[PDB]
């Protein structure tokens, strides 16, 4: 079986992305991101603390004639900005664009932190890290992705992402006609249950290409790229008159300045990184100062490859027995 679904920015700086998914019978839709870097599907529900919910649609499982409380589980996650949300389990049928996953667990949020009530077009988050990650207690729980493995026809799912633009997730098959060129394949570890992958490079615009190793995870649910301090240091460089700023807690640029491409390597291919895509505005409305969207990662203790750099490719994240990430230009 496959299964296909449009995912879209929630705002003008594709600052993330969300998927129809329905869950319960009869189905009740829920916008949900979807994040390779955790291992929970956690929704906003009739359970939410009423105060902590501002305009999500939530979860009933009271009316799912498939909901099944899971008896004694509970989880709670934290998110490496900070974010964190707790609650009870719930199994229930679970569909993403025609594919279905029948005794999914439905991670049901009793408490949510702020800015996940602050974002009001978020409904809840589909995790699609491996599954030693997921945080149910006192019985791990599959992700979607490894409940619908068996029955998909190829166990992969694609990430297609647009910029400024809608863009598609599929299940079970390679969209052949999405993406332009070779597919190129890399060597994926999950000993910290990520997609963890190691670049063999970078360049900035125009520049000489520099082989060096980077090791990092593919994350569609982290809206920057984070980079070693060397790296971003020497893209920053090439922008007049940007500077690291304490107070903003990043890069910033005059927004008046052009921005040059990041290129990075997947084996010997290159995928660029158009210098727009670096681009996320003012740091406050009427600013004249700009965000930049690649940062330094010496805070995070690990590089991220978010959707600034995914949604300039075609990604294919493997899930056979031998994991594996791929990567094309489109
Ligand atoms: N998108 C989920 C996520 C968030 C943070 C991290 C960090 F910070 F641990 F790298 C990994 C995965
Ligand atoms: N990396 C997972 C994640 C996704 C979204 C959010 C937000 F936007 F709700 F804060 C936090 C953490």
């Not at 569609?220 to 790229?225: Q, V």
């Given at each position: 079986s496959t299964g296909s679904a449009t995912t879209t920015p929630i705002d003008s700086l594709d600052d993330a992305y969300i998927t129809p998914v329905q869950i319960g019978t009869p189905a009740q839709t829920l916008n949900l991101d979807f994040d390779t870097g955790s291992s929970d599907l956690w929704v906003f529900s009739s359970e939410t603390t009423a105060s902590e919910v501002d305009g999500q649609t939530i979860y009933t499982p009271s009316k799912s004639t498939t909901a099944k409380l899971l008896s004694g589980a509970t989880w709670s996650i934290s998110y490496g900005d900070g974010s964190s949300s707790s609650g009870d389990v719930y199994t229930?049928?679970?569909?993403?664009?025609?594919l279905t996953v029948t005794g999914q667990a439905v991670e049901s949020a009793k408490k949510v932190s702020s800015s996940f009530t602050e974002d009001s077009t978020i409904d809840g988050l589909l995790g699609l890290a491996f599954s030693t990650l997921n945080t149910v207690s006192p019985t791990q729980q599959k992700t979607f992705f490894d409940n619908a493995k068996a029955s998909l026809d190829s166990p992969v799912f694609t990430a297609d992402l647009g910029y400024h633009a809608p863009g598609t997730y599929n299940?079970?098959?390679?969209?052949?006609?999405?993406?332009?060129?070779?597919?190129?394949?890399?060597?994926?570890?999950?000993?910290?249950?990520?997609?963890?992958?190691?670049?063999?490079?970078?360049?900035?615009?125009?520049?000489?290409?520099?082989?060096?190793?980077?090791?990092?995870?593919?994350?569609?649910?982290?809206?920057?790229?984070?980079?070693?301090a060397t790296v971003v240091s020497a893209y920053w460089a090439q922008v007049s008159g940007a500077k690291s700023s304490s107070s903003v807690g990043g890069y910033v640029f005059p927004c008046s300045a052009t921005l040059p491409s990041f290129t990075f390597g997947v084996g010997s291919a290159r995928i660029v990184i158009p210098g727009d895509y670096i681009d996320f505005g003012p740091i406050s409305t009427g600013s004249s100062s700009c965000f930049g969207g690649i940062q330094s990662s010496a805070g995070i203790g690990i590089n991220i490859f978010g959707d600034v750099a995914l949604k300039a490719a075609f990604v294919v994240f493997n899930g056979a027995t031998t994991p594996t990430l791929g990567f094309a230009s489109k």
């Open positions: 229930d049928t679970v569909s993403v664009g025609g299940f079970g098959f390679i969209d052949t006609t999405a993406y332009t060129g070779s597919i190129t394949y890399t060597a994926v570890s999950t000993k910290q249950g990520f997609w963890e992958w190691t670049s063999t490079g970078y360049a900035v615009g125009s520049g000489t290409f520099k082989s060096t190793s980077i090791d990092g995870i593919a994350d569609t649910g982290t809206t920057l790229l984070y980079l070693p």
